[PDB]
């Protein structure tokens, strides 16, 4: 085969994004490359062997918070594959953990496979559709040499859980909760590119602190760790094939 | 220059919600592959007088054949379809649940006035607006005034079914309607500002006796046609107006 030779990052929140930008030196896209009127950002750059992009679903209009949820992950990871061919695509971001799968506060986890929790369609077929039970891309090399934990993950367009929420985040047995991560992996295999995940914990579900406040209260902390851990992750990359991870 | 519609696009996340629309305008199925190649999605295209009619399904799923039902699809079929397409207005049309109290019964083929997801909950000021991501239909009251459909507010989450939490946001939201994709079709047509109408045909009643799968599956053929039946009055009444007069 042939070294990887361009990965595009797929960030919802654009502050975890921006270290990120500026620690491989990335420029905003000036030219609306994935569409005109949008408020999704893009930067792009060349780092010795990869080109390196990472899009936002960018500032929501009316008040300019994050357009997070599965929705605009979608549509970004749609775009930006369209537009620019990349041989990998990475989803980082934060996330909830259960403390009795072993996550903790700042753990920056690799994903072995991604489901549903909120897409419940009690008919045959439609069943194992909803849930989307996807594999992400085999990663045993970056595993082992940056020492990062693994498990699980479980997507929906909720911050918090609801019971029925829970019971199947229970009966799926995953390790981490998020936005977006389900959704990425569906457009990724329709288009047939490696993904690969970097989810890392803010909050604990199984603990005694509300949702929203402890994800709120560690989400500066944490995205720092995530940088830290998709900075080595870019630089492990680099001149490999996917084979060799 | 303002010119009257010359472009529709349907977004109809079913094939077979789709078919008794194409066939009755005799629309052909594209080969060029319009949205981008490697993909399940489906397009039908035609010319109805002096209207073209594009009408876009998610496709079939690779595993069983089922249709990608959902917003995800949906918001990607409306994305690629906006782009690649240009359309002057869009058109979802799809099934639904109706809550009988809020006047709903089978068979009917609602207009949509407003559209909101009830499970998206972000409860962080800011982003719980958006969640909810409440949004206007496109105003067609000549329409309305002509096809004499009901009118209601529709829900929209990626569940058939209906937790006790999505219930108390649906009845606290005062919907009448309850789909999959309709909210997120609004909100992609939102980003391209471009014009978005619902029609919703109501195939069981959330608040009624039979199991909601059930009576979906039982009541899809009928409704349906139901559908096909509005959809076709839409699109000739559209024919020929510009938008400000529908
Ligand atoms: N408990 C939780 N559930 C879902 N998403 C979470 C979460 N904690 C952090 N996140 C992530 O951070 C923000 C969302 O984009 C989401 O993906
Ligand atoms: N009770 C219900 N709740 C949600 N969607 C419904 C429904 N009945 C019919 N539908 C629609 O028909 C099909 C789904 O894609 C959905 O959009």
New interface residues.
Partial sequence: LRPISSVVFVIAMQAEALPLVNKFGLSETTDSPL?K???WVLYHGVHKDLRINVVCPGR?A??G?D?????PA??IT??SI?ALKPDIIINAGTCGGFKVKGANIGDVFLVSDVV?H??????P??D???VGLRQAFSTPNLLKELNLKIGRLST?????M????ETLIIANDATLKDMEGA?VA??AD???IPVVFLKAVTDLVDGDKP??EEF?QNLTVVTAALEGTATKVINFINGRNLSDL
């Avoid at 357009?67 to 929705?71: E, I, K, L, M, P």
């Avoid at 929906?156 to 918090?160: A, H, K, R, V």
Wanted: hydrophobic share 45%.
């Fill in positions: 569409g009127g949008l408020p929501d009316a008040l918070i357009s997070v949820g599965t929705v979608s549509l749609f775009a369209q549903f909120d897409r419940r369609i009690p008919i077929m439609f194992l559709y909803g929906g367009d909720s911050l918090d609801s019971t029925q929420d959704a569906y457009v329709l288009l047939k949702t929203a709120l």
